[PDB]
Tab-separated table of C-alpha atoms in Angstrom:
chain	number	residue	atom	x	y	z
A	1	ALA	CA	0.000	0.000	0.000
A	2	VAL	CA	0.937	3.669	-0.412
A	3	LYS	CA	-0.505	6.737	1.287
A	4	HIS	CA	-1.309	10.385	0.670
A	5	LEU	CA	-1.419	12.260	3.968
A	6	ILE	CA	-2.309	15.873	4.581
A	7	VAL	CA	-2.137	17.921	7.755
A	8	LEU	CA	-3.918	21.259	7.806
A	9	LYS	CA	-5.180	24.251	9.722
A	10	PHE	CA	-8.388	25.947	8.623
A	11	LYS	CA	-8.628	29.690	8.227
A	12	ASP	CA	-10.341	31.318	11.207
A	13	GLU	CA	-13.329	32.435	9.126
A	14	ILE	CA	-14.281	28.912	7.993
A	15	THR	CA	-17.564	27.811	9.637
A	16	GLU	CA	-18.218	24.410	11.197
A	17	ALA	CA	-20.666	23.486	8.431
A	18	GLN	CA	-18.007	24.482	5.897
A	19	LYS	CA	-15.425	22.258	7.586
A	20	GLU	CA	-17.968	19.444	7.378
A	21	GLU	CA	-18.392	20.271	3.677
A	22	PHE	CA	-14.632	20.156	3.160
A	23	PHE	CA	-14.261	16.650	4.581
A	24	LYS	CA	-17.478	15.285	3.096
A	25	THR	CA	-16.376	16.507	-0.331
A	26	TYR	CA	-12.861	15.081	0.036
A	27	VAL	CA	-14.131	11.727	1.276
A	28	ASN	CA	-16.597	11.593	-1.628
A	29	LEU	CA	-13.677	11.486	-4.068
A	30	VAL	CA	-13.605	7.707	-3.450
A	31	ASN	CA	-16.828	7.631	-5.462
A	32	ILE	CA	-15.160	9.557	-8.312
A	33	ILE	CA	-11.519	8.434	-8.357
A	34	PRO	CA	-11.172	4.627	-8.750
A	35	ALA	CA	-7.583	4.664	-7.500
A	36	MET	CA	-8.681	5.548	-3.930
A	37	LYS	CA	-8.762	2.427	-1.767
A	38	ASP	CA	-9.634	4.081	1.553
A	39	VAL	CA	-9.921	7.546	3.083
A	40	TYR	CA	-10.170	8.834	6.649
A	41	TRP	CA	-9.911	12.197	8.334
A	42	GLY	CA	-9.626	13.276	11.925
A	43	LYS	CA	-9.337	16.202	14.285
A	44	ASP	CA	-6.315	16.262	16.616
A	45	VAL	CA	-7.238	16.055	20.310
A	46	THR	CA	-3.788	16.530	21.787
A	47	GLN	CA	-2.830	20.051	20.641
A	48	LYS	CA	0.793	19.600	21.723
A	49	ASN	CA	2.012	22.659	19.802
A	50	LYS	CA	-0.911	25.077	19.520
A	51	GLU	CA	1.474	27.652	18.054
A	52	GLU	CA	1.994	25.400	15.023
A	53	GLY	CA	-1.681	25.733	14.116
A	54	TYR	CA	-2.434	22.320	12.592
A	55	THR	CA	-5.726	20.720	13.697
A	56	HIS	CA	-6.835	18.152	11.106
A	57	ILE	CA	-5.503	15.147	9.233
A	58	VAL	CA	-6.676	13.424	6.043
A	59	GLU	CA	-5.204	10.083	5.006
A	60	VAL	CA	-5.793	8.380	1.647
A	61	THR	CA	-4.674	4.818	0.911
A	62	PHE	CA	-3.836	3.236	-2.468
A	63	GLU	CA	-3.000	-0.202	-3.862
A	64	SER	CA	0.232	0.806	-5.510
A	65	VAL	CA	2.547	3.478	-6.828
A	66	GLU	CA	0.626	3.471	-10.120
A	67	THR	CA	-2.795	4.253	-8.676
A	68	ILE	CA	-1.667	7.033	-6.328
A	69	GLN	CA	-0.233	9.079	-9.212
A	70	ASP	CA	-3.513	8.571	-11.060
A	71	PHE	CA	-5.204	10.112	-8.044
A	72	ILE	CA	-2.778	13.016	-7.629
A	73	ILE	CA	-3.433	14.405	-11.116
A	74	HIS	CA	-7.073	13.355	-11.406
A	75	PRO	CA	-9.139	16.378	-12.484
A	76	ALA	CA	-11.470	15.910	-9.511
A	77	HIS	CA	-8.544	15.918	-7.073
A	78	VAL	CA	-6.846	18.858	-8.808
A	79	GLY	CA	-10.190	20.644	-8.842
A	80	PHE	CA	-10.673	19.992	-5.154
A	81	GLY	CA	-7.313	21.567	-4.384
A	82	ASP	CA	-7.792	24.533	-6.683
A	83	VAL	CA	-11.093	25.448	-5.029
A	84	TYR	CA	-10.762	24.358	-1.391
A	85	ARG	CA	-7.224	25.716	-0.935
A	86	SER	CA	-9.230	28.775	0.081
A	87	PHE	CA	-10.181	26.918	3.267
A	88	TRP	CA	-6.726	26.312	4.735
A	89	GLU	CA	-4.072	28.559	6.267
A	90	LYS	CA	-1.387	25.875	6.611
A	91	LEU	CA	-0.923	22.586	4.716
A	92	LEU	CA	1.590	19.747	4.854
A	93	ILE	CA	1.550	17.016	2.210
A	94	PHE	CA	3.146	13.576	2.412
A	95	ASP	CA	3.200	10.798	-0.146
A	96	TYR	CA	4.951	7.656	1.009
A	97	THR	CA	5.088	3.890	1.284
A	98	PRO	CA	4.361	2.620	4.807
A	99	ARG	CA	7.082	0.340	6.189
A	100	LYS	CA	8.008	-1.257	9.500
B	1	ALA	CA	-8.956	2.933	17.357
B	2	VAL	CA	-6.883	6.085	17.666
B	3	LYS	CA	-3.943	7.197	15.549
B	4	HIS	CA	-0.716	8.553	17.039
B	5	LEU	CA	0.875	10.509	14.192
B	6	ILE	CA	4.432	11.844	14.251
B	7	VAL	CA	5.758	14.241	11.644
B	8	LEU	CA	9.443	15.066	11.665
B	9	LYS	CA	12.428	16.728	10.066
B	10	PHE	CA	15.891	15.396	10.897
B	11	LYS	CA	18.793	17.735	11.420
B	12	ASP	CA	20.917	18.100	8.303
B	13	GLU	CA	23.914	16.474	9.983
B	14	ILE	CA	21.980	13.316	10.890
B	15	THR	CA	23.274	10.320	8.933
B	16	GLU	CA	21.395	7.523	7.177
B	17	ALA	CA	22.707	5.001	9.716
B	18	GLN	CA	21.377	7.262	12.459
B	19	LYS	CA	17.925	7.475	10.802
B	20	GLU	CA	17.869	3.686	10.422
B	21	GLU	CA	18.561	3.261	14.137
B	22	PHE	CA	15.930	5.859	15.015
B	23	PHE	CA	13.059	4.106	13.247
B	24	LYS	CA	14.159	0.563	14.127
B	25	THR	CA	14.201	1.506	17.784
B	26	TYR	CA	10.887	3.401	17.711
B	27	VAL	CA	9.169	0.386	16.104
B	28	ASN	CA	10.728	-1.845	18.777
B	29	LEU	CA	9.486	0.626	21.380
B	30	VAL	CA	5.803	0.692	20.410
B	31	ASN	CA	5.770	-3.102	20.097
B	32	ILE	CA	6.218	-3.424	23.896
B	33	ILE	CA	2.895	-1.635	24.358
B	34	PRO	CA	0.022	-4.152	24.457
B	35	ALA	CA	-2.345	-1.348	23.409
B	36	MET	CA	-0.495	-0.869	20.111
B	37	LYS	CA	-2.397	-2.335	17.160
B	38	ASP	CA	-0.253	-1.269	14.210
B	39	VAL	CA	2.810	0.833	13.326
B	40	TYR	CA	4.382	2.054	10.116
B	41	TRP	CA	6.775	4.797	9.187
B	42	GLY	CA	7.474	6.449	5.855
B	43	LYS	CA	9.595	8.984	4.005
B	44	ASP	CA	7.847	11.562	1.859
B	45	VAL	CA	8.642	11.349	-1.848
B	46	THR	CA	6.719	14.459	-2.968
B	47	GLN	CA	8.785	17.066	-1.134
B	48	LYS	CA	6.355	19.977	-1.451
B	49	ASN	CA	6.528	21.047	2.222
B	50	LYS	CA	8.818	23.990	1.389
B	51	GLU	CA	10.225	25.933	4.333
B	52	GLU	CA	8.481	23.642	6.808
B	53	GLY	CA	10.679	20.798	5.567
B	54	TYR	CA	9.117	17.720	7.251
B	55	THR	CA	10.359	14.534	5.563
B	56	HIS	CA	9.236	11.578	7.673
B	57	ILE	CA	6.016	10.181	9.119
B	58	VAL	CA	5.337	7.634	11.868
B	59	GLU	CA	1.799	6.388	12.399
B	60	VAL	CA	0.960	4.165	15.358
B	61	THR	CA	-2.533	2.781	15.926
B	62	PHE	CA	-3.557	2.460	19.587
B	63	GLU	CA	-6.733	1.292	21.315
B	64	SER	CA	-7.425	4.639	22.978
B	65	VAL	CA	-6.299	8.158	23.754
B	66	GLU	CA	-5.723	6.968	27.321
B	67	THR	CA	-3.310	4.252	26.207
B	68	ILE	CA	-1.431	6.892	24.205
B	69	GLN	CA	-1.096	9.224	27.199
B	70	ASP	CA	0.172	6.361	29.357
B	71	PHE	CA	2.597	5.437	26.573
B	72	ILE	CA	3.989	8.985	26.426
B	73	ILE	CA	5.119	8.981	30.065
B	74	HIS	CA	6.216	5.317	30.095
B	75	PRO	CA	9.941	5.373	30.946
B	76	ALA	CA	10.865	3.534	27.734
B	77	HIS	CA	9.250	6.333	25.726
B	78	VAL	CA	10.831	8.980	27.970
B	79	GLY	CA	14.149	7.231	27.409
B	80	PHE	CA	13.658	7.143	23.643
B	81	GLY	CA	13.185	10.906	23.768
B	82	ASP	CA	16.273	11.365	25.957
B	83	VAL	CA	18.483	9.486	23.514
B	84	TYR	CA	17.073	10.619	20.180
B	85	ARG	CA	15.648	14.128	20.629
B	86	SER	CA	18.912	15.584	19.309
B	87	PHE	CA	18.175	13.792	16.013
B	88	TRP	CA	15.191	15.917	14.988
B	89	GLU	CA	15.092	19.564	13.944
B	90	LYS	CA	11.310	19.712	13.971
B	91	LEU	CA	8.654	17.390	15.307
B	92	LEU	CA	4.871	17.482	15.420
B	93	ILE	CA	2.611	15.008	17.185
B	94	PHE	CA	-1.105	14.510	16.570
B	95	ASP	CA	-3.615	12.078	18.045
B	96	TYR	CA	-6.935	11.478	16.339
B	97	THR	CA	-9.788	9.055	15.774
B	98	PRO	CA	-10.090	8.206	12.061
B	99	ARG	CA	-13.522	8.856	10.610
B	100	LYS	CA	-15.250	9.185	7.256
């Protein structure tokens, strides 16, 4: 498996319904992009470094290196980013192969 | 289940043998915790985190937030920190319940 992980902070003006919209729309990409095997999001409860801002995590899982790239440049994923970038103040992106 | 997510940047001077030891030992560490369900680590291949610079991810699955908090002050985890904290330039920790 391979993973696409994002860590973000919303802009202060974003409403709670709009945060719900953000995650519901992202999660729904599994119904649009065949390459997506699983998707989860979460809100951090620990807040170890409040000064760093980040509050939420989204993790997407794929079968292989081939399918994740198909996801990255899918028009629906690109479109999501181009529109909903307006929602975040800070973003970290990771693409990687889980290992132990 | 709850995810314990670590995001880090190693100091520039840290060697590849040092990074190998770091992750081998952290995986050994979480395996002594009965509450641990899964662990993986990964190195980002995308490298779009700019000035932030985070390169590596560790994700541990635990039964509960309580088992995480106990884990954090367990002397083996405190000891891991004592020995290896000089390895990382930046580190973020998040704990969250995956949802869809």
